[PDB]
Design a protein around this nucleic acid. Sequence first.
DNA 1: CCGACGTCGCATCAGC
DNA 2: GCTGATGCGA
DNA 3: GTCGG
Length: 326
Amino acid sequence: TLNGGITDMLTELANFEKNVSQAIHKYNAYRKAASVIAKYPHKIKSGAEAKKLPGVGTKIAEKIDEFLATGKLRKLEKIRQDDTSSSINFLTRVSGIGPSAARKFVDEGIKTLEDLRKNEDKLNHHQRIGLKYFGDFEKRIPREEMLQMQDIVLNEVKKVDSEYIATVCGSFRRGAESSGDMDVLLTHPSFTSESTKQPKLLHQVVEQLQKVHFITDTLSKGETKFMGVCQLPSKNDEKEYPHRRIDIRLIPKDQYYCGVLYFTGSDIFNKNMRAHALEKGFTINEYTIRPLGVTGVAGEPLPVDSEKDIFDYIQWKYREPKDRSE
DNA sequence: CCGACGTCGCATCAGC
DNA sequence: GCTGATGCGA
DNA sequence: GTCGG
Ligand SMILES: Nc1ccn([C@H]2C[C@H](O)[C@@H](COP(=O)(O)OP(=O)(O)[C@@H](Cl)P(=O)(O)O)O2)c(=O)n1
Ligand SMILES: Nc1ccn([C@H]2C[C@H](O)[C@@H](COP(=O)(O)O)O2)c(=O)n1
Ligand SMILES: [Cl-]
Ligand SMILES: [Cl-]
Ligand SMILES: [Cl-]
Ligand SMILES: [Mg+2]
Ligand SMILES: [Mg+2]
Ligand code: NA
Ligand code: NA
Ligand code: NA
């Protein structure tokens, strides 16, 4: 990491703006600049050099100059001193506690892990599970464990219905040596953009994974998206593995390529690519790519028979999953 | 100088 | 209940 | 906070 000091600074500023300021566009701007700087293949020597990169403007350039000269950023040194900002930033590290809930908890005197555990009463279901596994959810998953988890998920899915196809996406599909959680794209021929011919398609996979004690908790669940918790089995006398976040997304089978493009990410890559689509006159979601008429209303879905077809429409050279870790 | 910034699923709540 | 908005998340 | 028209 040539520029890790700068990128950490911008990331901390991004998180400040999201959690404390509740300024989602500043959050995205800071993360976009951190990402372009992270892939820049030179050790940055000045703010002016960084300002050449798209997403780095005047203000970030000045912060880079202060950071290069001093090793620090006074704006951040002060944010770290604000008790309210410290409290809010801590509380939002619990899954299910966002910017608004964190600020309300602080108002109510609930500011520390101690306070949260004393007040499970005041937590919704999601937050209660985020608190239960607070430590575990900050541990990363070695790719070796991702492979064991993939084996279980793919085999249990096959036992329910051999026509399911489960694909592990996220950073795993991008070839990362570790991942923050497990993301699973699911398809079944009974669920297409034209009809849903079988109910409970997601539910049946979730129940089977619960049956074998792989899924341990549910954060939210609907007809096409599961957000929950899972755990690898341990051997005799072994310490248990940490509990891990798992997301399962059921996507219409004929829309698999848009779905796997979405779920492979990264999230910044998707934002960048979707914004480029818009400048090229297209809109992309996890289901389709459609043209945008001058009216601004999306037209009919365009034929897609590969991930690369999506890149072709917007005049981008193809980028393998490994090259999408923005 | 300023409007737009990616797109959408599930949980929650307010008004009717 | 339904609908629409907001929060939080992918 | 940055960018493009
Ligand atoms: N705001 C977002 C968040 C996620 N996503 C997509 C892209 C992302 O790759 C996918 C899974 O989300 P996750 O937060 O798990 O991101 P990952 O790419 O898997 C890595 Cl941050 P990690 O989960 O391995 O740490 O969902 C998105 O489009 N927009
Ligand atoms: N989860 C998945 C994965 C692949 N597929 C289909 C889409 C393609 O037509 C086909 C090609 O397989 P693969 O992409 O794994 O090479 O598999 C699916 O329907 N659901
Ligand atoms: Cl903002
Ligand atoms: Cl600092
Ligand atoms: Cl669509
Ligand atoms: Mg992930
Ligand atoms: Mg723009
Ligand atoms: Na720039
Ligand atoms: Na949180
Ligand atoms: Na995830």
